[PDB]
Amino acid sequence: GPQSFVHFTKQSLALIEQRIAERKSKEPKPSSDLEAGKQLPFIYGDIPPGMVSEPLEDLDPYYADKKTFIVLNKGKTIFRFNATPALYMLSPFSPLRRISIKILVHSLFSMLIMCTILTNCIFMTMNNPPDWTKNVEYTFTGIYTFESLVKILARGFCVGEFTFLRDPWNWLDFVVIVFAYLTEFVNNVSALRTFRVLRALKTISVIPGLKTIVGALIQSVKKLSDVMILTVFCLSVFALIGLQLFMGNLKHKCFRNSLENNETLESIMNTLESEEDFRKYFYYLEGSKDALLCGFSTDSGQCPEGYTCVKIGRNPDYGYTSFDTFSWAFLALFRLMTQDYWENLYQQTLRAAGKTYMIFFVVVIFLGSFYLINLILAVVAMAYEEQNQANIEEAKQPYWIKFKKCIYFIVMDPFVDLAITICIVLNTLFMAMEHHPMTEEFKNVLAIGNLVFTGIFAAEMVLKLIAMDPYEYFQVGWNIFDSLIVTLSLVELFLLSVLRSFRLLRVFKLAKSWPTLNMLIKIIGNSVGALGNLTLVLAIIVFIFAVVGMQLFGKSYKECVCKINDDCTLPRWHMNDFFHSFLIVFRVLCGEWIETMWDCMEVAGQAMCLIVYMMVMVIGNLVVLNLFLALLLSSFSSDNLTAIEEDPDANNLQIAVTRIKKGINYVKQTLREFILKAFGKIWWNIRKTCYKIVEHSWFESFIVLMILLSSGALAFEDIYIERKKTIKIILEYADKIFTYIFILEMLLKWIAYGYKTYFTNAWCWLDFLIVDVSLVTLVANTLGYSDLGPIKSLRTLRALRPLRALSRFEGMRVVVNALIGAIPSIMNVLLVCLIFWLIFSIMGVNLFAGKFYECINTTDGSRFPASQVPNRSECFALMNVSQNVRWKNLKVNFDNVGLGYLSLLQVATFKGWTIIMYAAVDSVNVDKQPKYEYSLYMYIYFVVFIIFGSFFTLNLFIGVIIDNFNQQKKKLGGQDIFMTEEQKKYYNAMKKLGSKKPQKPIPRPGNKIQGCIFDLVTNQAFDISIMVLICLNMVTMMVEKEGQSQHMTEVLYWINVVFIILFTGECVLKLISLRHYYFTVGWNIFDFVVVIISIVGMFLADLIETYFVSPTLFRVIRLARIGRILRLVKGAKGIRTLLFALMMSLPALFNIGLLLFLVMFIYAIFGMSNFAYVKKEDGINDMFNFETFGNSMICLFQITTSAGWDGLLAPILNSKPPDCDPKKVHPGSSVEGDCGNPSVGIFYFVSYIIISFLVVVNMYIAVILENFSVATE
């Protein structure tokens, strides 16, 4: 009640002391709604005028026994002070304490502190500040002291409860103040400034809500214990496997065969220091910082003639890429899990070891990279959903009127809206017609059309304003938006590219009639609406990391620049100033953290760079993922609440189309009226016999075998087939047999099903089309017209033969059914994304049309300095003199809107984006030689695009593809959509392995001894001891490295032998103790198997390293030791359930992987057909090309994850000289030319990386998130 409002007087303090005396004699819970930092319950109504900001008696009966008072702040917010005198000196009734409390609660105080923090943040971003900034620094320090002193005078320093030191953030404030004082009094400056960076964290304290957001983030990260344990364990196991396999393989190099002066390899190596010195003895590829890797196997890299492969020197990438030690192997496997630049590691390892080692990378990229990432996403999703449910539950608990009316009739009609929509679409399609190589008349017509459209829009605004007055005009967000767009367009007319491009935003007006374009606007609005605090936390964190990196590493980048750049100038990416530090942090968030980290370590030490980079990655990715999941779930759940009816007031477009259709029907009826006024018993059995035959299993299995045989026969048509003439002949004749068999099968299926039943079936249609192609090619070849252009090209369609297996295999049929059922929403979102990206493509065209041309030196490929050759005229004057000069242009640029689309795809996938960025930020003008970072602040264009078009689009896409699967599951009846009927039974039976109750204890034996052996074996002490022994064995495996001395090798061997005998001893004790009940437990029989394979592998390795010689087989056999450490999962309940989730999801992932492998096979055959003779460049080299089935499969697996697809596509975009040679002659073959086909290449790669995203990401995630919700019950 309002009478509870009474001042806190000395008598009240005495009474409260008496109450605490009563409490002591006595020797509950504070009201949650009455805690500090919250608003009063409304039962208290208003505050009396002479009461606000005064020490009022406590309003909580809980504190009635304790000395404590309350203050109230104009704004209905309660603070809970302490009635004890401050510092044993200042009483609560003292002028100092009164004024300090008033100040503290005043809102102007907090506003000033926030402004001070924001200004100090601006001052933090200065690599070298001017001398005079010490005055501003002292101003800031003094303001912080005043704030802290006011807080202390208001609520004591640490005298009891509710004191300055009690709140954690007050610790930070104190730490900042003492550090600021100590640095000045003492005056490594870098550490002092890096600690000065902590002031930015006070923003969380001052700005409301950020504290709760950070608490939520910490609670979220508290739930990832099991996932992080599993991730560390899996990365450790894979690191051990890789260390066993590839130890020292990356030190291989090609070394000169013929050595002068009777030199030796050791003598040479003891002297060389420079890369120039090294290049004289080892084989270096042109423009490479590392010696070419070679191998001793037949499928490894091949050294040139006169060079031999030798293991010596340092590992590539400054020495940071290796498996020589467990630490470096762990770094490599973490890089593989995050999939950052993993294709370089893939290629290096394959070159150094052998192409048969792609199995390691396949297993790692699926068992570790994707599955663990999806586990992390699923766990964060479950945390955010449980936090949302809690929040929802808590919330639940005179002459002018003539023209006004006339124009209101004219310009508010539905047809005006339809006309304006048509005009907007026409204007956008008209502005998408600009290109770098445009003529003067075309420029004129574009200008005229732009003027016409802007005039139309301005006239429409004027009319819609005079019809209805501004006081109502400006009441609509759409009206004010159109007003800003049109006024900016008029400003542009009176005065650029950017102002011209801002008109593009009118496209969003279609969101009213486009349901799935309103979803994107809702996502973007939530990012700054409900989740504004989360976005603000992200921005603050990124700013803090950028400043920290700058302060720590700028001087190092400036000084040790010759360790990372040959020219001794700052590289493209550095931390020497705030903009580049921010760019590095943003790139790390995008997912690229190793190439820049290498230079970081080179200049500024491994410990510092690793610590900072790991902190940045972990924290930034946690926050980014939290924001992503929050946006997704909010938009695709909270938005669904049936707030209002479906268009209760029909949209103007809807009304106009209704009128149009009514008029069309009226015209149709009138025209119809006007024109009417003006003027066998055996055949039936035969069909039965064919049906019985073609529905027989034997027949189905025979046809499946034939499909597999014909499918496989396509893999033998390499470039080397001319060396296998017998196989050539056999394959031609087998092709004829297959065509005959399939024609007969089609005829039988006709006679059996009927024409109607056969041709109302998509599988039958597909089979019929394939056999039609085969028959056409066979007939043409028989008639001898086997080389008539299009007929030759039609032979490439034989790559479609494998498609006949989809209808045969039930799992692939189920998965393709899911894809087919989800295809409409995919098309919807694809259209939305294309429209959204058209804006960015047009803006990029306007910014960068024709500015990527440069004059280069073709020998080195180095851009001529813009002092000489400033423009293309001078470049041509220079070519007329020299010979190896060229006015080249980037292959993927912004010359027109299609090339802009391709460039944006590369930027959004983060593959090849760096080349485009470099060209863009160098771009000067059209027909002008680029300069270094002349247009430096063009990086913002790519930053904004990556944010919007590559984060929000990915929000929308994932959100809609996951509903279309939830809707499919609900429609089927709560049934798994990726699992077959025969797999459903196995899945149901398997679900009971995660819920069986414990069995009865195994009976004690009879003997006194065996019985004593029983008690031990059945003890938690025994179990823990065995676990510790397993851990020690794993440590002994880790300690091994490359180049270790023979003494260490022997001592490690003996330690492992002792471990083996100990584990065998414990197994034998268990056996004799449990008798025959030992094998009733799966973990027991797993341990028995592991023991047996351990013993056998030890003996086999001993034999192979003695009686035989085979290092590869020795290394592979030594991998039996991993089974000893795989037993740690037995006791770890946290990760056992996650692995159970994996084993539950295996059946569906099998079907998905089967379909993916079929798609990869088809694409590999097409690649062998097309790109087998393209020029060796970029990602196409002697070892990764499309010249063979193995090479093609390696490349396709590489780009299944969207890694290096830009590099693989680059050689295929060559189509005319001097890029390619159309009349090149290939020895040993009749094919001519090494040019590529730009259109076929673009379609091939884009479609592949698209089919890739709809299976590796949308379907794999869907399945793993589906089974994680089951395991967790």
Binding site: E273, S556, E559, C560, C562, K563, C568, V603
Partner: protein, 119 residues
Amino acid sequence: MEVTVPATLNVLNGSDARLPCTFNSCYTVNHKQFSLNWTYQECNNCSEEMFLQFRMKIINLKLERFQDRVEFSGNPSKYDVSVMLRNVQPEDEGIYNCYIMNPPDRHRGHGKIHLQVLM
């Protein structure tokens, strides 16, 4: 390049004086490229006399005014390029100058030491 030297050095007559010249170049001190250029001037405006260099090995020019009392006490391998002098007389008083150039670095150092002889 950063060079750390004392502005003024005071030593007693007849005592051995060590001139502290040091640098902290980021790169390793390749002895095959390191360059030294120690010089002496009785005054700032006075001319400078070469008396101790380092091209590939420590070379002392043994000027008459210093006799054989000037030697090298530090080591590039460890970023100390100090100079050691015996029994300072009342004439060595003046200004000492180390000039350093450690490739692949480009900035050229300059360490100046003022030696003073006390009673």
